[PDB]
């Protein structure tokens, strides 16, 4: 079973019209980056070249943006959460984001309470940001949420309520509690009448894309492809929005990867500008985790969680697929392809990570 | 992570008597090392400290001898093969091996590493090698031997029958049989191989003393018994059989090696296939900040046992039985790297021989 077939169903984007989004362009991302540069400990996350994997896979370059090095968060999500939380305080205290002093903000009345529902990473970023800026945070999590993730939030001095409901009901509970107690809801999803905060979050995320382009230009390379994991659409939307502003929608083959098991602002950009959509099996992410965590040849090693590794896992699944030739043609992958991948999270759930990479959970063999 | 139960059948060695070996001690291992040190490109293979894994598993130290770095061969076996072959040439040319620099032909059967070592030695010393491999042998391993200028014949038979054909042809053409196993009337060469292997153990002791540590345990993969007995023979001569908790690991022969094991081993483990698979994955994607080691199926089974014990529901008792605790300094030998690249990546990437289903 070196030759294996995992579900990697490719669909051309029927909604594609190449209309770019001026709200999520270079300029707004560069403003978000200038905020992040002020936080003590800021450093662009590594853009790691998987040369030996690229040679194996039959492409020119594989570049993995390692968002596990994003401060101490082990995930990218603070880029949006902290930026939006900063913009909210600048509104309330009549400050300009361009000239924000954290020290001045600290000695400005009553502490604000930030409320959000999370599966893990987003809420941790809200809790982190509320801990930095001296504010309250109350994070809600649905049932079956990993205790390590509940613990990582509590370690940031914030409350974390595990409910007996799913995500959607827990969002409604967060909204109901926030309306009854006067809290500021900070969700990475948008809906009717809630669009300001999610907009900032998406602009925030584009920081990683702004970094990645600088890093690629430093390398003297031009990306032909990018794989973006879908999640709720915010990261993919924001990052794609930025990348098409830089490269043009026609010169960038963007693949949006949706694992088997949303934000309308992000999805508008994805409908307009995404090249292809892949619907993929659970075991694809798992495969990507292993390839990243035990690299090929002399490639550098990357610790990538379930949500983080799926982009890369698709490339691996294609390479070992019986129909490799036709799949590479469909995705226009070839000896000249320079493929940007984003590893959005590290081993945020250590138990699951080591089950995948050591015990062999979600193995190729079904 | 998850709780699971792989086969790790531990039995105490009831044959234990603590009698050391006159054949496989420090003095022979040091003569073997002095020969190896003379070979162009020699360098003691690394002894890697997996401190963060040791902390996770609840021991003081896990030290892995990484024989994937043994020259360019991705395995340890040349230490025996090359030495024995050098000892054979010094007899034929009446030379002294202690100070050394018609064409013989060496014939052997192999699953991979031993034959490659033999083939390497023949190429280095301007001699001939004819290597026989059984049906189903990995083509990469065949190529590795062919690229050393040797003949590599892949039979349509199993190992035992391929050994017979090696014996038949060797007698026919007057070739010198170089096997890592011993049988009646065939002891001189296997003995040299076992002594040559001890080099790695001599290195490991030098490296541990450089760290200022003393091993409480050693886990040795059983194989044909040549490595285990040769290495254990050296280790018990250094530390005494009493103060060394040796564990011989047999995944699912050699009387010379097995006598030392019967004498000096503390315990034998019979383990499941997936145990070696687990070790390959743990070594190849390390914990915390530990160094990464590339270890093949035969390489990683010692470490795999440690990982299987740690995750077992009966973790506490298994540790008691193996006398593993927060003070345990555990030596593990990674006998080979990724000698079969296809099989390696199937284990580490595809999750072949997964813990569960």
From Swiss-Prot, chain A:
Family matches, as Gene3D superfamilies: 3.40.50.1100
EC top class named in words: lyase
Catalytic activity: (S)-2,3-diaminopropanoate + H2O + H(+) = pyruvate + 2 NH4(+); (R)-2,3-diaminopropanoate + H2O + H(+) = pyruvate + 2 NH4(+)
Positions bearing N6-(pyridoxal phosphate)lysine: 77
Effect ascribed to mutating residue 119 to N: No activity on D-DAP, 150-fold reduced catalytic efficiency for L-DAP; alters substrate stereospecificity
Effect of residue 188 to N: 10000-fold reduced catalytic efficiency for both D- and L-DAP
Induction trigger: Slightly induced by DL-DAP.
GO molecular function: diaminopropionate ammonia-lyase activity; protein homodimerization activity; pyridoxal phosphate binding
Effect of a null allele: No growth on minimal medium plus DL-DAP; growth can be restored by a mix of 8 amino acids (Arg, Asn, Cys, Glu, Ile, Leu, Met and Thr).
UniProt feature coiled coil, ranges: none
Keywords associated with the record: Disulfide bond, Lyase, Pyridoxal phosphate
Active site: 77, 119
Listed result of changing residue 77 to H/R: No longer binds cofactor, loss of enzymatic activity
EC number: 4.3.1.15
pH-activity dependence text: Optimum pH is 8.0.
Domain of life assignment: Bacteria
Requisite cofactors: pyridoxal 5'-phosphate
Annotated cofactor note: Binds 1 pyridoxal phosphate per subunit.
The protein's role, per its UniProt record: Catalyzes the alpha,beta-elimination reaction of both L- and D-alpha,beta-diaminopropionate (DAP) to form pyruvate and ammonia. In vitro the D-isomer of serine is degraded to pyruvate, though very poorly; other amino acids (L-serine, D- and L-threonine, D- and L-beta-Cl-alanine) are not substrates. In vivo allows poor growth on L-DAP or a DL-DAP mixture but not on D-DAP alone, this may be due to a poor promoter. DL-DAP is toxic in the absence of this enzyme, it may inhibit enzymes involved in the synthesis of pyruvate and aspartate, as well as amino acids derived from them.
Assembly and interaction partners: Homodimer.
Family to which this protein belongs: Belongs to the diaminopropionate ammonia-lyase family.
Name of the protein: Diaminopropionate ammonia-lyase
Gene name, Swiss-Prot/TrEMBL: ygeX
């Amino acid at each position: 079973m070196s030759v294996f077939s995992l579900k990697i169903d490719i669909a051309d984007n029927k909604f594609f019209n190449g209309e770019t989004s001026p709200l999520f362009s270079q300029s707004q991302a560069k403003l978000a980056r200038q905020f992040h540069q002020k936080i003590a400990g800021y450093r662009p996350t590594p853009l790691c070249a998987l040369d030996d994997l690229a040679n194996l896979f039959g492409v020119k370059k594989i570049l993995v943006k390692d968002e596990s090095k994003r401060f101490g968060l082990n995930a990218f999500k603070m880029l949006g959460g902290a930026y939006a939380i900063a913009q909210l305080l600048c509104e309330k205290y009549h400050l300009d984001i361009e000239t924000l002093s954290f020290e001045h903000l600290k000695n400005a009345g009553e502490k604000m309470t930030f409320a959000t529902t999370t599966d893990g990473n987003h809420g941790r970023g809200v809790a982190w940001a509320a801990q930095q800026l001296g504010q309250n945070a109350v994070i809600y999590m649905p049932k079956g949420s990993a205790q390590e993730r509940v613990d990582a939030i509590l370690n940031l001095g914030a409350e974390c309520i595990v409910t007996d409901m799913n995500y959607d009901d827990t969002v409604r509970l967060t909204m109901q509690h926030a309306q009854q107690h006067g809290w500021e809801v900070v969700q990475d999803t948008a809906w009717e009448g809630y669009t300001k905060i999610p907009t900032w979050i998406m602009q925030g995320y584009a920081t990683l894309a702004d970094e990645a382009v600088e890093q690629m230009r430093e390398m003297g390379v031009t990306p032909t492809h990018v794989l973006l994991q879908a999640g709720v659409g915010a990261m993919a939307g924001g990052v794609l929005g930025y990348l098409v502003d830089v490269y043009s929608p026609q010169n960038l083959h963007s693949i949006i990867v949706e694992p088997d098991k949303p934000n309308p602002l992000g999805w508008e950009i994805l409908r307009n500008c995404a090249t292809q959509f892949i619907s993929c099996q659970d075991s694809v992410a798992a495969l990507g985790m292993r390839v990243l965590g035990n690299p090929y040849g002399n490639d550098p090693r990357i610790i990538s969680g379930e949500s983080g590794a799926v982009g890369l896992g698709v490339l691996a699944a294609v390479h070992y697929h019986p129909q490799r030739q036709s799949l590479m043609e469909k995705l226009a992958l070839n000896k000249d392809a320079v493929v940007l991948v984003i590893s959005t999270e590290g081993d945020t759930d250590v138990k699951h990570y080591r089950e995948v990479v050591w015990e062999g959970k979600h193995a190729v063999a079904p």
